């Protein structure tokens, strides 16, 4: 797992994105979709959404991004102590969104790009390295948790 001083680090940006989640949430989620398309298939109402300002003008999307990251922030929190909130992620995740591991992937290196984007002088690289470790956590506990339920990665 991570040090204590690693999980200050990763808290310590976390609060920064706190600061406005809504707009990393939107800048995470243009980045995944220019980065990686085929993410964008998963979800049915956004697709509509041909051009970047349709996208920031959306609040459906803008909420969605709002939940996402309200979650992935309880689960920072634990520290790694976080079974009893990565359950329900897991069941919906696997079983009803259907989202492969690699896409989970794929929206952290979202979220490594935005972080280092709005907050350079505070995603150094040892900040980088925790939240790498954090989110690498996060993939490898969820899967098992994938697997637990059926059906792999
Ligand atoms: C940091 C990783 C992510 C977190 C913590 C997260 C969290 C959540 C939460 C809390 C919800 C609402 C409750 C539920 O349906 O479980 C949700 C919904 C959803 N997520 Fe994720 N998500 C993550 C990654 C992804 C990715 C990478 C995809 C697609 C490539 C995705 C697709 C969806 C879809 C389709 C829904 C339903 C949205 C709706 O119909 O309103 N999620 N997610």
Same mark, same amino acid.
Do not use: C
């Given at each position: 797992?991570?040090?204590e001083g690693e999980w200050q680090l990763?808290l310590h ?7 406005? %989640? ?7 989620? &243009?980045?995944?979709? #220019?980065? $990686?398309? /085929?993410?964008?298939? @998963? ?22 991004? %709002? ?7 309880? &689960?920072?929190?634990? #520290?790694? $102590?976080? /079974?009893?909130?990565? @359950? ?66």
């Amino acid at each position: 797992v991570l040090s204590e001083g690693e999980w200050q680090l990763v808290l310590h940006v976390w609060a920064k994105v706190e600061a406005d %989640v809504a707009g990393h949430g939107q800048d995470i989620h &243009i980045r995944l979709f #220019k980065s $990686h398309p /085929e993410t964008l298939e @998963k979800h049915d109402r956004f697709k509509h959404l041909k051009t970047e300002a349709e996208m920031k003008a959306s609040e459906d999307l803008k909420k969605h991004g %709002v939940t996402e990251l309200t979650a992935l922030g309880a &689960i920072l929190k634990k #520290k790694g $102590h976080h /079974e009893a909130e990565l @359950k329900p992620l897991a069941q919906s995740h696997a079983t009803k969104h259907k989202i492969p591991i690699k896409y989970l992937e794929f929206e952290s290196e979202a979220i490594i790009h935005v972080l280092h984007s709005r907050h350079p002088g505070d995603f150094g690289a040892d900040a980088q390295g925790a939240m790498n470790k954090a989110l690498e956590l996060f993939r490898k506990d969820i899967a098992a948790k994938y697997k637990e339920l059926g059906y792999q990665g």
